[PDB]
A paper describes a structure:
GMPS is a class-I (trpG-type) amidotransferase in which the catalytic reaction occurs in two physically distant domains, a GATase (glutamine amidotransferase) domain and an ATPPase (ATP pyrophosphatase) domain5. Hydrolysis of glutamine to glutamate and ammonia occurs in the GATase domain, whereas formation of the intermediate AMP-XMP from ATP and XMP occurs in the ATPPase domain. Ammonia generated in the GATase domain attacks the intermediate to generate GMP.
In the structure of PfGMPS_C89A/Gln, glutamine interacts with catalytic site residues Gln93, Asn169, Asn171 and Asp172. In this orientation, glutamine is within hydrogen-bonding distance (3.3 Å) of the catalytic residue Cys/Ala89, the ensemble mimicking the pre-catalytic state of the GATase domain. Upon superposition of the PfGMPS- (conformational state I) and PfGMPS_C89A/Gln (conformational state II) dimer structures, the two ATPPase domains remain invariant, whereas the two GATase domains differ by an 85° rotation and a 3 Å translation when going from states I to II. This hypothesis is reinforced by Asp371 interacting with Lys386 in PfGMPS_C89A/Gln, thereby blocking the enzyme in an inactive conformation.
Residue numbers in the entry:
A (entry chain A), B (entry chain A): 7 to 133, 137 to 151, 154 to 389, 397 to 482, 495 to 555
The structure:
């Protein structure tokens, strides 16, 4: 089952192939000007159209023959157009493509469209209501996007021309802030179209859309099941389990606690657990995180650090978020090294274990904004060990269940690097932290009691013997650069605010953030 | 139909009579030790028990005979106990009254109880859940409180002993923060009990509960209908319509615009309208308020003032709310006098028209907190003219409809004295006002568009080319010292926040206040 791929001049053409090789599907390359005789004798159950530096309507521009396109639809050959490829599918099928209003380059989020998802569009006036615009186009109920987490997906943009008129009898599937008709799907001829480049590493769900295309749509008979795994990288390092050591910043997050779980199984004695209580943690996490780790991992060597006093004194006076982040970052590297320099081992023979995920890499790769980022800490040059570099968050959740670990660790909302520092606005103090912790803990303990925690991506509190003002944050994260605010039922919401202003001393006003990202952010500072 | 009133030593006993005389019901006085023979020959269709400096259970304390109480219930004579009077009704009917945990003195709000109203109680742990406590007592569906605006009512407290055990087969009707079983009602014997003193001027709904008691419960045949009126005071001043003049601070509020409407009819030429644009007003109120007034009152002499520049320069640097209020107040008296000193008339022969209401007097009388107060401005000694001194807000709404005035003026939320000054936190600027006005106007224009404005007591925005944070305020006011926060439907709420962060330049975050009063307030500063 060879899937045919055609080149139009895309600088990402090899990535299109490399994607197929990672998902272990056979592939054969031909250009955009192949005579039918060369692809008729071959068994082909799919077609892919690449991008190209040319304009889809200008003179001398690369295209396909008229009779070769009428060869696919009759033989039931699913088509897939990328960027310039999508534009080619439009032009040949009575669709109009002209120069766009504004170009698109870099990381970009696109909205999957149902008749339900239409409400999630804010940019209606960019090209002026929600349904007032999508009444001109078709929709449906969700097949390319089978098994996708959210209705958003981060993709790689590189183009200046977009589609202007949807081809004959097509469904509009996706839209972006600067490209309305971004993705299409013909149910009749089983054709898919996309303006972005899913093959690019920056595109998060690129391999997922390819797996659904060739397997679940083109019906290729697999023949290659295992392939890429979290254990493949682990089975590799097994050949170093006596030569070197492995250290890890035990933070308490699911990413660090289930990465250390396997790396302790390999380096049973050569593994060092380093947990640092910066004093910027939540209520009782100074002990509960440590106590839990020692209990669940008895054989694991754990070194607990209390540099909280070194964090407070160094943050005194500092009110600017950037310098507050700069201090915490440049101080975390110190207390970590100092801890490593308490356990005498070969520095040139040791690994740096970092539960790093595929989305974490791109979030750092595609430099957009790093205020809401979680993995912050990502004079000693280590050989970095990131076995989950090609893995997802939902994946890690599955492994943590296989290890008989509780659900408490897999439901735990992602707690960022700088901690409560960017949650205490202005001057930071040990007193303000105490007040914020009392408020934050009540807020969380209730969300658990009434069962809303699991339905929220991330929830916390912000502080704005003086009486202070508190803000309650609760979001529904779709991508690392876009999120909504969770709509807490009022009856439940009322109880929390009632139980905070009554019990906690030092607060007389509670606010709830009702601003989305963009243009806002998850974290205040 | 004489209503019997009994004295126990209350210092407010005459007020109990004075209330009856205002509602024009016949009354006859006897003490707490009347022999039955004196009240049997008299036609009595009601009974009232007053307070007293004594304790209801101590030795030598004033009480009633056992056979005189068994005289009412058989002859169908409705009873009404006040403070010590209520405590007497309890003791004689197998109810227990002991010294309270904490005393109560001054203005106090009490909660009317249904099975619905139980959720409005926050002080459950003062004597620990909502229904967990009121499951021991009885409730019902709302007769003493016929035609009452809210489920709260401001009353006058003076006592140290409260009831501890509800008398045989009684309904619990009201509760306070320091007195659980505050008001009772026996459906069997038609008996009512109250810990507070409704006869006191400070008690807002004192005359209302008396009108329902004697008329709607005791069935007295009226014989006196007109009595107190808004026109009685107006018909009085008619004897000065040539001797003196009348000036009024035209603000734009319903209280000033429908008070000037009548006073212009009397002093057709001797009346002066003074509207001051302090620059702290809402969007376009600098002209819309003036233009409306001149149009609806063509014959009325109106003097428009633009002291906005005198308000800004004087408020520069001032960030403390108290001094911000102190400046505005001490400056409003200046621009008003200066305006009066532009119209040469006899200063010793002029009236000061002030649309003042009965609740406004008590709000100032019972000095609790004046941050949320509306009537703020309440070297020239005038003869004050307050014809609505004994009138309610709901009353004024009825008169403004009789004058064929639009609903726009009767739905207009009460806009306070200091204006947008206490809504711009910190340094005040002409720039910040522009940004706040754009946000506030959008917020209001939407509440009108989606029809929530009328269901809200008061709604506005607060600001916290720099990007600033905005807070949206929307409350359900029950009393001038207690209020909830309105629960805006999310779909509607989402649109507003979406339309502010997109259209308004200078804001990147929107918050919504979810704190009630107490312990918070309506206004930030
Ligand atoms: N990457 C691309 O395909 C961009 C090519 C060309 N600029 C276009 O408008 O499509
Ligand atoms: N005003 C009153 O009736 C108070 C009297 C007395 N102190 C009591 O506890 O009732």
């Amino acid at each position: 089952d060879k899937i045919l791929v055609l080149n139009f001049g895309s600088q990402y053409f090899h990535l299109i192939v490399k994607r197929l090789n990672n998902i272990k599907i056979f592939s054969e390359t031909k250009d955009y000007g192949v005579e039918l005789k060369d692809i008729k004798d071959m068994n082909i159950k799919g077609v892919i159209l690449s991008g190209g530096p040319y304009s889809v309507t200008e003179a001398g521009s690369p295209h396909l023959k008229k009779e070769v396109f009428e060869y696919f639809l009759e033989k039931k050959i699913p088509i897939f157009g990328i960027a310039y490829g999508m534009q080619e599918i439009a032009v040949q099928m009575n669709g109009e493509v002209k120069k766009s209003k504004t170009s698109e380059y870099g990381c970009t989020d696109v909205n999957i469209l149902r008749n339900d998802n239409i409400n999630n569009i804010t940019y209606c006036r960019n090209f002026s209501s929600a349904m007032d615009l999508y009444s001109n186009y078709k929709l449906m109920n969700e097949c390319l996007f089978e098994n996708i987490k959210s209705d958003i997906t981060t993709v790689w943009m590189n183009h200046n021309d977009e589609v202007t008129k949807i081809p004959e009898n097509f469904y509009l599937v996706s839209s972006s802030e600067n490209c309305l008709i971004c993705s299409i799907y013909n149910k009749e001829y089983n054709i898919y179209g996309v303006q972005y480049h899913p093959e690019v590493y920056e595109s998060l769900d690129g391999e997922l859309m390819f797996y659904n295309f060739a397997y679940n749509i083109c019906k290729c008979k697999k023949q290659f099941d295992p392939i890429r795994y979290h254990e493949l990288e682990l089975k590799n390092i097994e050949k170093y389990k006596h030569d070197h050591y492995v250290i890890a910043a035990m933070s308490g997050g699911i990413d660090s606690t289930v990465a250390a779980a396997y790396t302790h199984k390999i380096f049973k004695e050569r593994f060092f657990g380093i947990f640092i209580d910066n004093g910027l943690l939540r209520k009782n996490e100074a002990e509960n995180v440590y106590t839990f780790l020692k209990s669940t991992f008895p054989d694991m060597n754990i070194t607990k650090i209390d540099a909280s006093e070194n964090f407070l004194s160094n943050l005194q006076g500092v009110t600017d978020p950037e310098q507050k982040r700069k201090i915490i970052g440049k101080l975390f590297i110190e207390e970590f090294e100092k801890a490593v320099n308490n356990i005498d081992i070969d520095i040139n023979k040791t690994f740096l274990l970092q539960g790093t995920l595929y989305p974490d890499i791109i979030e750092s790769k595609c430099s957009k904004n790093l205020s809401d980022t979680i993995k912050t800490h990502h004079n000693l040059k280590f050989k970095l060990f990131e076995p989950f570099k090609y893995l997802f968050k939902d994946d890690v959740k599955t492994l943590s269940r296989e290890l008989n670990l509780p659900e408490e660790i897999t439901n735990r909302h992602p707690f960022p690097g700088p901690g409560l520092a960017i949650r205490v606005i202005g001057e930071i103090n040990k007193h303000k932290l105490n007040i914020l912790r009392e408020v934050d803990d009540i807020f969380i303990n209730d969300l658990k009691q009434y069962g809303l925690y699991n339905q929220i991506s991330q929830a916390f509190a912000v502080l704005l013997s003086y009486d202070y003002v508190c803000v309650l944050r609760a979001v529904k994260t779709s991508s690392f650069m876009t999120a909504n605010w969770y709509q807490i039922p009022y009856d439940i919401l009322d109880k929390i605010t009632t139980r905070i202003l009554s019990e906690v001393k030092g607060v007389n006003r509670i606010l709830y953030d009702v601003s989305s990202k963009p243009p806002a952010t998850i974290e205040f500072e």
